Amino acid sequence: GSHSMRYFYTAMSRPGRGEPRFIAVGYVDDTQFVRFDSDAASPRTEPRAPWIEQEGPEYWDRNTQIFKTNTQTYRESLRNLRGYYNQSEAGSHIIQRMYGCDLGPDGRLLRGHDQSAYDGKDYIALNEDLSSWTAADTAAQITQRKWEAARVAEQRRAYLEGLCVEWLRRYLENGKETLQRADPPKTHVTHHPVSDHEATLRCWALGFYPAEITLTWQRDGEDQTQDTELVETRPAGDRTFQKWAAVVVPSGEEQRYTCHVQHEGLPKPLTLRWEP
């Protein structure tokens, strides 16, 4: 199917408690594969998925250098943004960066991404054209002007259309037994009387990969969107994810309710009902 690679950087200042901490993690789809943490005893890029372990020492050395350089760049950037917002030296602040490439089912570049936030609010983003920027405010306009002056977008475009796709395609091949394997959800419906004339029907999806799933309740074939409690999809810790959707129904009316499940790993969509 489709696939993506992303790097996620977080730089966090902490005045009085040393230099800002820089973390980087890398994902392919919903699978993390590398990490770097400037607070580690001996900071170096470390593997987090088995299929990346086969990469050689130059790879790990290249990654580590890159992240050590970023550590110092983001420290300067935090000092710069503090300035742009006339903020005190006293507070903690966070820059987050996301970037990477999306591929379509054929392996072709679908689009690239590069976006940043400051204190959890959008700050600046590379537009889909991979040429121009969208700046959130007059501070980010300073960054935009700097990046326009240094032709950052052109360099971003080159990476996103080139190395990003090249390396993603490699990882997809090297990790093909997992990254290109969709594990369908295991599903079932549970019943929990609430009172004499209401019960909860909870539909479960367990053990699935990737995390993308649709899980709805219908009553008489009509979506019960407002009435369904739908928990956030959550990691099981073994690469797979879990989710449930619950509806409170009138006693005796359980069979006017159906749980519908859509997921890549399914030979076909499921329709489930409580089975007393």
Binding site: Y7, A24, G26, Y59, R62, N63, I66, F67, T69, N70, Q72, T73, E76, S77, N80, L81, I95, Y99, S116, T143, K146, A150, V152, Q155, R156, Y159, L163, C164, W167
Partner: peptide, 12 residues
């Protein structure tokens, strides 16, 4: 693989 980014180009 992450992008190589010199500080003099990529600083905010």
């Amino acid at each position: 693989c992450p992008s190589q980014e010199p500080m003099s180009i990529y600083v905010y």
